[PDB]
Design a protein around this ligand. Structure first.
Ligand SMILES: [Fe+3]
Ligand SMILES: [Fe+3]
Ligand SMILES: [Fe+3]
Ligand SMILES: [Fe+3]
Ligand SMILES: [Fe+3]
Ligand SMILES: [Fe+3]
Ligand SMILES: [Fe+3]
Lengths: 172, 172, 169, 169, 172, 169
């Protein structure tokens, strides 16, 4: 047992490790989306810039959890990072919806982790999640929701002019 | 025979000379396209800048090949620069498609030139093509693919508003 | 078929996609090593810095291949990123040396392939952006392994401490 | 017919199109001369700079005419750019003098035309941007030809070397 | 056997070592030429700087190959550096002519090294030579030819005024 | 016979020429030592930088001797540069100490010659530019040799690691 472990439940340790896989998985999904819009038959350079930035942020969510695992005296166990659920993403509106679905699933997992940490009376772990994860997710979901709303009002996906302008005037 | 010639086959010398004519030809074509959009009844000022920039680049592609010819001890032979295959280019999408066909023809001639240079064991000429031409054509061709793809999704060529906005927000 | 594809074989495409997976696997392997050295019972902070930097660089190798796939008109296909396969720093440097040689052999098979299909663009891309990077990387890891062994690693904990302060610092 | 065309005769349009071709032809001639002096068996680098500079300038004369064609509502029609028709530096400077006088004679034919068609804008365009350029250009080439003759060109290779160093540098 | 060696043929290693000797020999030749023109009865200071600059450039060619040898896991094996083939070099034109012949022999050795590297499927060694050696030799041969051509046009070597002015106005 | 020669004995001229070869030989030795320490199974980067510096410094000694030869009116005659005659860092420093002592012994024989032939200028050249450089060179190498032995070289690889970082860095 670690010389620094104190008030760190085994269940919290296992859940952090599963959350690390989830954050890495989300990074893969966003990385997949990005280069889909980098394709010459999609060619929305700013969508690809948007999803690539999100891919790097999820990777940082993961590295910071690995850092916490060590801080509390637990032990990282890594798993496979499953491939994303689409190779082809149809459109910019459709992609924004999948990102909203994914970011909501990450939030649901972070809220289960906080419920667990409260169950185990782990205030440091509770406030770690509240500080670094919970509100970041609240803004990502509100942000992704604004975009879906606008892309729909403009005539996406049937109007290719709509996604061009959105990609210029919102994602630029 | 030149005091500097070494490992430079006749066939490579002849091919460089044909490649010089092609590069000047592409310069003439983009120059033709450019001022077509400069006309008051077409009047897309940024399409004309995009193509004028490309016309100046092909002139640099040719002059650089003329420079290599002298470096390797061969002798420049100049031919007529044939007039472009269209005087009226229809629209912006159509110009972009002819630009893509032309850059692909230039690329195929360079690939034959590198196949030639490999078969004649001219490693210096091979690296010349790789450094100064092959990756430039890959980017010109992917770039033109992006523009064609977007112009079609925006509703070109039947929608003149599309080419107006594309000229403002992409070629600006 | 893609409007930009020209002189890009289907085998070259399939290999680029396979190489993308390997580069991402290499990033995962180094990331695993890094935070191993961040553990309080290892506590070699510069070892952890070194491996984390190499992890991010493999992510740069992978994204650049995804960029090339689109440039040539091919289509990205992603697979699972398999989890890595660490005792001490000398032992980690040795697995990294084994890993960069494996990534290197995969790149040489891809360049032999691109040479066979007469793809001079893909040949130069591999030569330019990947091949000399692996030669530097492997020579560097070889230096570290060599030095760590002469100082008395892994049996000497003073050795890996000092190597972490004066070489990786 | 163009919504901007006003007092621009069809003969003036046809002639501007011919003058465009000649300007591009002159650029080709100078481009040919330039890289001739870049050859290792000629090796007069400032002669080669000089002619390349003139090649880019004739290209600037041509593109300005393509601009005027559109300003008046006319329509550009392009033809082939004929290949140029060099022994030494004095010989090249003399062929350049013959060429600039032919471009000049063509421009004066264009101004007589514009005068006959009562096109004062086209007249001042030629007076402003081309006529004094040709007079300058021809006086310059004459100065060089005169000097290279007095120094002993072309049989004296010391002459063309020094001229390349001290006048064209 | 080296822990870093991978796809490096014993023949390529042996060829690098011989090329190391040739680059040091070329360095010796230029150094000999340089101080020949420093002599009080020749007294062309800029010819002597020019060859001295070339002597140092060849040493850099040697040290960089000594670096590659170690990078690929081979073993440097040094030989005698044989003295240059002339003590007196007659004039500046004759020295430039021996420099031209010397760079052509160094180039021919490099083309044989690349042919070797091609036939043993060492693309890294193939590109090293292309990047750092092949075009440097072409420019070096093109430069030496220009100087040779110009010196002969001025009346060298029988005209001492010719080599004086060349030393002032070209090599100054 | 040269128009500048005055009080320069043939033996001194011949002795300068032999000293030129010895300096180039010392340069070959240090360059050989340097890249030995660049090897991945030796991997002491600062030893390799130290010897590379000395290799370049010996080349400066030779060229200055080539400069004096022309200044006094003698004639440079070059010979083959014989290949160098390395185990560890201590052993390399010991051959370097041995080498500088032979270059020094040759310089003191050159100064004895110059004194016997009444060449005060050549006497000053050796005094100013060479003799004290060698004393500093030999005193330094002895210091390094002394320290390596105290730290446990060559049987202690940790000793040469630390010496390379803390003295030669
Ligand atoms: Fe996240
Ligand atoms: Fe081109
Ligand atoms: Fe990699
Ligand atoms: Fe290459
Ligand atoms: Fe003109
Ligand atoms: Fe060289
Ligand atoms: Fe010395």
């Amino acid at each position: 047992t670690s010389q620094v472990r104190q008030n760190y439940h085994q269940d919290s340790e296992a859940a952090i490790n599963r959350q690390i896989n989830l954050e890495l998985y989300a990074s893969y999904v966003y990385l997949s989306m990005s280069y889909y819009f980098d394709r010459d038959d999609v060619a929305l350079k700013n969508f690809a810039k948007y999803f690539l930035h999100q891919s790097h942020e999820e990777r940082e969510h993961a590295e910071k959890l690995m850092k916490l695992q060590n801080q509390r005296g637990g032990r990282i166990f890594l798993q496979d990072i499953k491939k994303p659920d689409c190779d082809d993403w149809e459109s910019g509106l459709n992609a924004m919806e999948c990102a909203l679905h994914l970011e909501k699933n990450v939030n649901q997992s972070l809220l289960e982790l906080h419920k667990l940490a409260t169950d185990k009376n782990d205030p440091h772990l509770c406030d770690f999640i509240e500080t670094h994860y919970l509100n970041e997710q609240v803004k990502a979901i509100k942000e992704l929701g604004d975009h879906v709303t606008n892309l729909r009002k403009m005539g996406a996906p049937e109007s290719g002019l709509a996604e061009y302008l959105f990609d210029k005037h919102t994602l630029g």
